[PDB]
Amino acid sequence: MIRLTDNRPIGFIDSGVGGLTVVKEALKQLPNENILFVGDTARCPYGPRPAEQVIQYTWEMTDYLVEQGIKMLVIACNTATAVALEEIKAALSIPVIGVILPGTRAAVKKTQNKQVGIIGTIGTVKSQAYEKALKEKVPELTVTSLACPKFVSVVESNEYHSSVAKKIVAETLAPLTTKKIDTLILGCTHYPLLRPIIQNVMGENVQLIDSGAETVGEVSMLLDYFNLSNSPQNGRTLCQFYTTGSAKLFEEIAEDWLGIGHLNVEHIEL
Amino acid sequence: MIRLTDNRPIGFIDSGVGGLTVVKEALKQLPNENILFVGDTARCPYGPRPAEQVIQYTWEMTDYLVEQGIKMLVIACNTATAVALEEIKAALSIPVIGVILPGTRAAVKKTQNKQVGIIGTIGTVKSQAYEKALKEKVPELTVTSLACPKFVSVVESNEYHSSVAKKIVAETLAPLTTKKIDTLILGCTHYPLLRPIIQNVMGENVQLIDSGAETVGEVSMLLDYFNLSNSPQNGRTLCQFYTTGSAKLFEEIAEDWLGIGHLNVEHIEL
C-alpha cells in the first residue's frame, strides 16, 4: 500500500577502517541509499578494551550519527556488535543491525558437509561468538575457528595484494586446508581485501562468506519491512565519512579500498 | 549476546488453500519452527470482495491466531496482503509479513535484461501491485503482467499435473513467451503447484520467482532480527491447520500438496 520515500542516510559505525568493506557492499547493493560512516580510529582498537569502554564509545558514535539524521544503524565491526548491539537496538527507535548473525545465517545455508570454518582476530575467535551462533542453529556442525593475527595489519597497511600478504595468509591458513571445510566465514571486516588470496589458499571448492555483504543483504530486507527505502528518483546523493583520527590516513585508505572517486572525509571529535 | 529460545508457533493466515505453498516452504526452510495455519475457505474468495470485508475477515483470522499464541504473523495471500498488511502490522506487537514485497525484491535481484513478468489472478494483476512495487525499485524495468483466469481452478481441483493443466497453462502463457522475459513472478500462492508446467512452457532461461518461498526467506531473517527463533533442540513439535470451511476438503488438499504424513486439520468458526 503506502510506500514512503525516506532519503535520510543509513548509518555505519566502526572502531576503525574495517567497516569500509561493509560500506563498499552497501554502495553496490543499495545504489539509491545515502550513507554516513564513522570510524573511531582515535580509540581503535576496541578489542583489548573493557566492555564498558566499548559500549560507551559505541554509544558516542551512535548518538553522533542519529543527530546527523540516520534512519537505520549498522554496527560494522565484530567487537561493537558483540558488546553493544542489543543494548543500542533496544534503546533506539530506528533499526539496528550487527555483523555476526547475517554471516552465520549465510554459512548455515551454504554448507553442504557441515564442516564450517571461521577466521578473524584472536579476540573474535576467543569470544566464540561465531561458534555459538552457528551451533545454536545447527548443532551437528563441525566448526573450526582460526585466529589470523597479522591479517588486519596487512590490510590496514594497504599491502593486501603484496608478497608479504600471500605469505602471511598461506602460512596462517595452512592448518585449515586439511579439514574438509566447504564454507569459511570471513569473521573480520578487514578480510574482504584479502579475499583473492584466501580463496586461492583455500581452494575453489570452499565457499567464502563475507559477513558484511550478508549484513547489507539483511539491510535491504529491513528497508522494505520498515518502509524506510529511498527512491530511485532521488538516488544516492550523500556519502559522508567521519573519523576521530587522522582524516588523511583515512581518506587514503578509504579511496584505495572503495576504489572509486574522491571521498568526503571529515575529522570529528566524540 | 542473549539469544532467546521461543517455541511459540509462526502464524499463517489465508483466504483459502493457496497459502499452503507458503507453509510448505516454511516447513522446508524453517525445520525447527512450529506452525499454525488458518484458511477462511467458508468466505473464500476475498478478491471480488470490498476492502472493508477483507480487512474484517483478515482481522478475525489474525485475532484467532494471536489468541492461539503466535509470535509472528505471515499473511500468505496477495489479496489480504494488499488490503490488510499495513493496518495489522501497525496495530500488532508481533512482526507481520506479506507476500508481495519479498517476491518483488527477489525478481529485481534475479533479472538480467530488466524484462520482468508476473502472473496471478485478474484481481492481483488489475491491482497493479507488483508492477508498482517493481518499478518503485527499478523504474527501467519492462514489466509484463498477465492474468491466468483458470490456474487457481486447476490447482484447487488437484489437477495441476493433468493434461487439462498443461493445455490451460500452455495457452494462457503463450503471449508471454515472446517478450524476452528472463524473470517471471508467480504472483499467486496457488501457482507453485503448476511450476513444472510453467517452467517448461516458459523455457529454461526464465527464472521463476516463488513469492511465498521468498517471503519465508524474509521470515528467517526476521526471526534473528527480533530474537524470536525456536531452538533445534526443541525442533518443530507443532503444525496445526484451521479452516472455517470443510475440514475434509482441506485435509484432502493439504496432504496432497504438502506430500507428507497425516496433517492436523480442524474446522473452526470466526
Side-chain angles (χ1 to χ4, degrees):
Chain A
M1 253 299 94
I2 298 176
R3 201 94 303 253
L4 295 177
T5 292
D6 197 324
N7 70 342
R8 288 181 297 157
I10 296 176
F12 300 74
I13 58 180
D14 175 46
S15 54
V17 292
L20 279 167
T21 66
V22 184
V23 169
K24 183 178 183 176
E25 202 64 34
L27 293 170
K28 184 174 66 177
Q29 296 183 59
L30 308 164
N32 303 315
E33 298 292 330
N34 295 314
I35 309 295
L36 289 191
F37 178 95
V38 174
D40 192 21
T41 62
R43 293 185 297 205
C44 169
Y46 277 27
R49 289 172 193 282
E52 302 73 48
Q53 270 177 56
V54 180
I55 290 178
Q56 184 201 308
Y57 300 173
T58 302
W59 259 123
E60 292 178 9
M61 294 191 280
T62 296
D63 284 345
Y64 185 80
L65 286 193
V66 167
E67 291 184 50
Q68 292 303 305
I70 60 171
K71 64 187 180 185
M72 182 182 281
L73 176 68
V74 177
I75 301 176
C77 97
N78 287 293
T79 312
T81 296
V83 184
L85 181 60
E86 231 48 52
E87 187 189 324
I88 294 173
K89 162 147 68 181
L92 298 187
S93 285
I94 66 173
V96 181
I97 333 306
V99 289
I100 294 172
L101 285 185
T104 298
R105 192 182 315 132
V108 160
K109 191 173 188 178
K110 281 286 187 179
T111 187
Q112 297 305 303
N113 59 23
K114 293 181 163 56
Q115 305 311 296
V116 188
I118 179 276
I119 51 168
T121 64
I122 185 52
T124 294
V125 170
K126 289 308 177 182
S127 72
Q128 298 192 302
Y130 278 101
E131 187 182 4
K132 290 197 300 290
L134 285 167
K135 292 183 175 176
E136 288 180 313
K137 297 191 174 183
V138 175
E140 317 81 62
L141 295 179
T142 297
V143 181
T144 301
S145 297
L146 179 60
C148 305
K150 303 195 176 203
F151 287 20
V152 162
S153 184
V154 175
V155 180
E156 266 171 31
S157 300
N158 271 326
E159 298 285 354
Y160 51 87
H161 268 309
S162 73
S163 47
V164 179
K166 301 181 181 182
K167 174 186 174 64
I168 291 180
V169 175
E171 299 182 303
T172 303
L173 273 39
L176 280 183
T177 67
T178 58
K179 295 172 181 173
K180 299 168 63 183
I181 293 173
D182 70 359
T183 305
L184 174 64
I185 297 165
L186 302 189
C188 176
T189 53
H190 282 74
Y191 297 8
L193 276 302
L194 295 170
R195 187 162 183 163
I197 302 178
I198 294 172
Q199 187 66 75
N200 179 66
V201 175
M202 290 305 293
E204 291 194 306
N205 286 315
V206 190
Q207 286 296 296
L208 302 186
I209 302 302
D210 181 330
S211 276
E214 296 302 321
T215 286
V216 168
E218 176 170 306
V219 165
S220 177
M221 285 159 228
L222 297 170
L223 286 173
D224 283 336
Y225 186 81
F226 290 103
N227 201 3
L228 292 172
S229 299
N230 189 194
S231 61
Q233 289 69 50
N234 285 337
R236 166 166 44 247
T237 59
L238 172 66
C239 192
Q240 183 68 50
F241 298 85
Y242 309 105
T243 180
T244 49
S246 46
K248 177 55 208 306
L249 174 61
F250 194 94
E251 167 168 38
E252 171 186 349
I253 298 179
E255 279 178 45
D256 180 9
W257 295 12
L258 273 44
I260 60 172
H262 170 60
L263 301 181
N264 301 306
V265 181
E266 183 181 66
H267 169 78
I268 66 167
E269 297 172 55
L270 302 166
Chain B
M1 253 299 94
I2 298 176
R3 201 94 303 253
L4 295 177
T5 292
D6 197 324
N7 70 342
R8 288 181 297 157
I10 296 176
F12 300 74
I13 58 180
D14 175 46
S15 54
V17 292
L20 279 167
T21 66
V22 184
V23 169
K24 183 178 183 176
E25 202 64 34
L27 293 170
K28 184 174 66 177
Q29 296 183 59
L30 308 164
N32 303 315
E33 298 292 330
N34 295 314
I35 309 295
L36 289 191
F37 178 95
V38 174
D40 192 21
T41 62
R43 293 185 297 205
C44 169
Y46 277 27
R49 289 172 193 282
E52 302 73 48
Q53 270 177 56
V54 180
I55 290 178
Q56 184 201 308
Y57 300 173
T58 302
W59 259 123
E60 292 178 9
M61 294 191 280
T62 296
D63 284 345
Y64 185 80
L65 286 193
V66 167
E67 291 184 50
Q68 292 303 305
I70 60 171
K71 64 187 180 185
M72 182 182 281
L73 176 68
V74 177
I75 301 176
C77 97
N78 287 293
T79 312
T81 296
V83 184
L85 181 60
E86 231 48 52
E87 187 189 324
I88 294 173
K89 162 147 68 181
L92 298 187
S93 285
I94 66 173
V96 181
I97 333 306
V99 289
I100 294 172
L101 285 185
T104 298
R105 192 182 315 132
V108 160
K109 191 173 188 178
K110 281 286 187 179
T111 187
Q112 297 305 303
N113 59 23
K114 293 181 163 56
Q115 305 311 296
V116 188
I118 179 276
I119 51 168
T121 64
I122 185 52
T124 294
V125 170
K126 289 308 177 182
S127 72
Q128 298 192 302
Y130 278 101
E131 187 182 4
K132 290 197 300 290
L134 285 167
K135 292 183 175 176
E136 288 180 313
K137 297 191 174 183
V138 175
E140 317 81 62
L141 295 179
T142 297
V143 181
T144 301
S145 297
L146 179 60
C148 305
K150 303 195 176 203
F151 287 20
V152 162
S153 184
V154 175
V155 180
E156 266 171 31
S157 300
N158 271 326
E159 298 286 354
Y160 51 87
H161 268 309
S162 73
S163 47
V164 179
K166 301 181 181 182
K167 174 186 174 64
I168 291 180
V169 175
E171 299 182 303
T172 303
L173 273 39
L176 280 183
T177 67
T178 58
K179 295 172 181 173
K180 299 168 63 183
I181 293 173
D182 70 359
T183 305
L184 174 64
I185 297 165
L186 302 189
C188 176
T189 53
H190 282 74
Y191 297 8
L193 276 302
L194 295 170
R195 187 162 183 163
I197 302 178
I198 294 172
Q199 187 66 75
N200 179 66
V201 175
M202 290 305 293
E204 291 194 306
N205 286 315
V206 190
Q207 286 296 296
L208 302 186
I209 302 302
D210 181 330
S211 276
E214 296 302 321
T215 286
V216 168
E218 176 170 306
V219 165
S220 177
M221 285 159 228
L222 297 170
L223 286 173
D224 283 336
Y225 186 81
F226 290 103
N227 201 3
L228 292 172
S229 299
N230 189 194
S231 61
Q233 289 69 50
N234 285 337
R236 166 166 44 247
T237 59
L238 172 66
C239 192
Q240 183 68 50
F241 298 85
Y242 309 105
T243 180
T244 49
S246 46
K248 177 55 208 306
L249 174 61
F250 194 94
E251 167 168 38
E252 171 186 349
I253 298 179
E255 279 178 45
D256 180 9
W257 295 12
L258 273 44
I260 60 172
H262 170 60
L263 301 180
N264 301 306
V265 181
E266 183 181 66
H267 169 78
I268 66 167
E269 297 172 55
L270 302 166

